[PDB]
Structures are given as C-alpha cells and as structure tokens.
Curated annotation (Swiss-Prot), chain A:
This is Glutamate receptor ionotropic, kainate 2. It comes from the Eukaryota. The gene is Grik2. It is found in: Cell membrane; Postsynaptic cell membrane. Glycans are attached at residue 73. The postsynaptic actions of Glu are mediated by a variety of receptors that are named according to their selective agonists. This receptor binds domoate > kainate > quisqualate > glutamate. It does not bind AMPA without coexpression with GRIK5. Belongs to the glutamate-gated ion channel (TC 1.A.10.1) family. GRIK2 subfamily. Ionotropic glutamate receptor that functions as a cation-permeable ligand-gated ion channel, gated by L-glutamate and the glutamatergic agonist kainic acid. L-glutamate acts as an excitatory neurotransmitter at many synapses in the central nervous system. Binding of the excitatory neurotransmitter L-glutamate induces a conformation change, leading to the opening of the cation channel, and thereby converts the chemical signal to an electrical impulse. The receptor then desensitizes rapidly and enters a transient inactive state, characterized by the presence of bound agonist. Independent of its ionotropic glutamate receptor activity, acts as a thermoreceptor conferring sensitivity to cold temperatures. Functions in dorsal root ganglion neurons. Sumoylation mediates kainate receptor-mediated endocytosis and regulates synaptic transmission. Sumoylation is enhanced by PIAS3 and desumoylated by SENP1. Highest expression is found in the olfactory lobe, piriform cortex, dentate gyrus, hippocampus, granular cell layer of the cerebellum, and in caudate-putamen. Homotetramer and heterotetramer with GRIK5. Tetramers may be formed by the dimerization of dimers. Assembles into a kainate-gated homomeric channel that does not bind AMPA. Can form functional heteromeric receptors with GRIK4 and GRIK5. Can form functional heteromeric receptors with GRIK3. Interacts with DLG4. Interacts with NETO2. Interacts (via C-terminus) with KLHL17 (via kelch repeats); the interaction targets GRIK2 for degradation via ubiquitin-proteasome pathway.
From Swiss-Prot, chain B:
It comes from the Eukaryota. Homotetramer and heterotetramer with GRIK5. Tetramers may be formed by the dimerization of dimers. Assembles into a kainate-gated homomeric channel that does not bind AMPA. Can form functional heteromeric receptors with GRIK4 and GRIK5. Can form functional heteromeric receptors with GRIK3. Interacts with DLG4. Interacts with NETO2. Interacts (via C-terminus) with KLHL17 (via kelch repeats); the interaction targets GRIK2 for degradation via ubiquitin-proteasome pathway. Highest expression is found in the olfactory lobe, piriform cortex, dentate gyrus, hippocampus, granular cell layer of the cerebellum, and in caudate-putamen. Belongs to the glutamate-gated ion channel (TC 1.A.10.1) family. GRIK2 subfamily. Ionotropic glutamate receptor that functions as a cation-permeable ligand-gated ion channel, gated by L-glutamate and the glutamatergic agonist kainic acid. L-glutamate acts as an excitatory neurotransmitter at many synapses in the central nervous system. Binding of the excitatory neurotransmitter L-glutamate induces a conformation change, leading to the opening of the cation channel, and thereby converts the chemical signal to an electrical impulse. The receptor then desensitizes rapidly and enters a transient inactive state, characterized by the presence of bound agonist. It is found in: Cell membrane; Postsynaptic cell membrane. The lineage of its organism: Eukaryota, Metazoa, Chordata, Craniata, Vertebrata. Sumoylation mediates kainate receptor-mediated endocytosis and regulates synaptic transmission. Sumoylation is enhanced by PIAS3 and desumoylated by SENP1. Ubiquitinated. Ubiquitination regulates the GRIK2 levels at the synapse by leading kainate receptor degradation through proteasome. The gene is Grik2. This is Glutamate receptor ionotropic, kainate 2. The postsynaptic actions of Glu are mediated by a variety of receptors that are named according to their selective agonists. This receptor binds domoate > kainate > quisqualate > glutamate. It does not bind AMPA without coexpression with GRIK5.
Length: 101, 51
C-alpha cells in the first residue's frame, strides 16, 4: 500500500529494491502513477530489469519522454480507442475546447 | 569520446549498455559533466551497478 499521507513512495520503493521484486503490478491513478514512476526513476528502479503493469486505464497520458530511453519493458492498458480516426479527431476537439489545463 | 559539436551522448550511452561497461572515468568541464550525467540517467544507466 502506497503511503496515504503523501505520494512519496521513498521507503516503499527502497523496500522493493531490497526485496528485488522486479515484476511489479500496480493499481493506481495516472496522476499518482506519474509520481510513483518519477520516484522510481530517482532510485534507478527504471532500467532493463524492472517490468511494470499499470491497472490505470490512462497509461498513454504519461509523459514517458524521460523514461522512453531507460529500457524498462513497461506494460499497461488503454481502453480509449485513440487508434480510430473519429476518436482521435474528438480527442483534438477536446484538447482545443479545454481552454484551461 | 563524447561527440563534438553537441553534447547528446545518447548513442555512446546506448553502446555502453550494449558494451556492458559498468565502470566509467569521465573527463570534462563540470557543465559537460552535468550534461553527461543527466543523459546517463535518461538511459537508466545510473544505478548501484555503475560507478
Ligand atoms: C522485456 O519484457 C520481458 C517480458 O515481456 C522481460 O522479461 C524483459 O526483462 C524485458 N526486458 C528489459 C526490461 O530490458
């Protein structure tokens, strides 16, 4: 269980490092998933060894640019059918309609 | 050698990962030192294995 006081998984992540649990399922929200990923990066928990799965259905929203070259074989799940052209067009319509982000 | 005309050592670090070189002795000004360390962190080449 991630600490409920704040999204600072420093002790829990260090415990995983001590336990050497490589394959690590998650069950989070993409907002908290981003923080967990960033804190994992600061511990070197994001290399060619670890292998995650995010139950979050918003994995594609993650800014994976700082992690794309890391070599982690991350996984996830996407239900938003963004591959379709109509869905994609509605996506840009949403992006332009959202004046404040 | 860190490529000249730029500071993006990305291919060098990737080759190091292919080369499995776990020990490194950099030699550069502190600005280039910070740059190369950040780029190494990008590839995740910065864990307790390396030195
Ligand atoms: C790539 O993913 C496989 C599982 O499909 C995993 O066993 C392997 O360690 C991964 N390679 C990495 C993370 O470099």
């Amino acid at each position: 269980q991630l600490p409920a006081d704040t999204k600072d998984a420093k002790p829990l992540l260090k415990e995983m490092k001590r336990g050497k649990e490589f394959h690590v399922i998650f069950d989070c929200s993409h907002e908290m998933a981003a923080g967990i990923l960033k804190q994992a990066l600061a511990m070197g928990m994001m290399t060619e060894y670890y292998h995650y799965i995010f139950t979050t259905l918003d994995l594609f929203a993650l800014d994976v640019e700082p992690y794309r070259y890391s070599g982690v074989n991350m996984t996830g799940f996407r239900i938003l059918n963004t591959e379709n052209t109509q869905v994609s067009s509605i996506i840009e319509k949403w992006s332009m309609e959202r004046l404040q982000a």
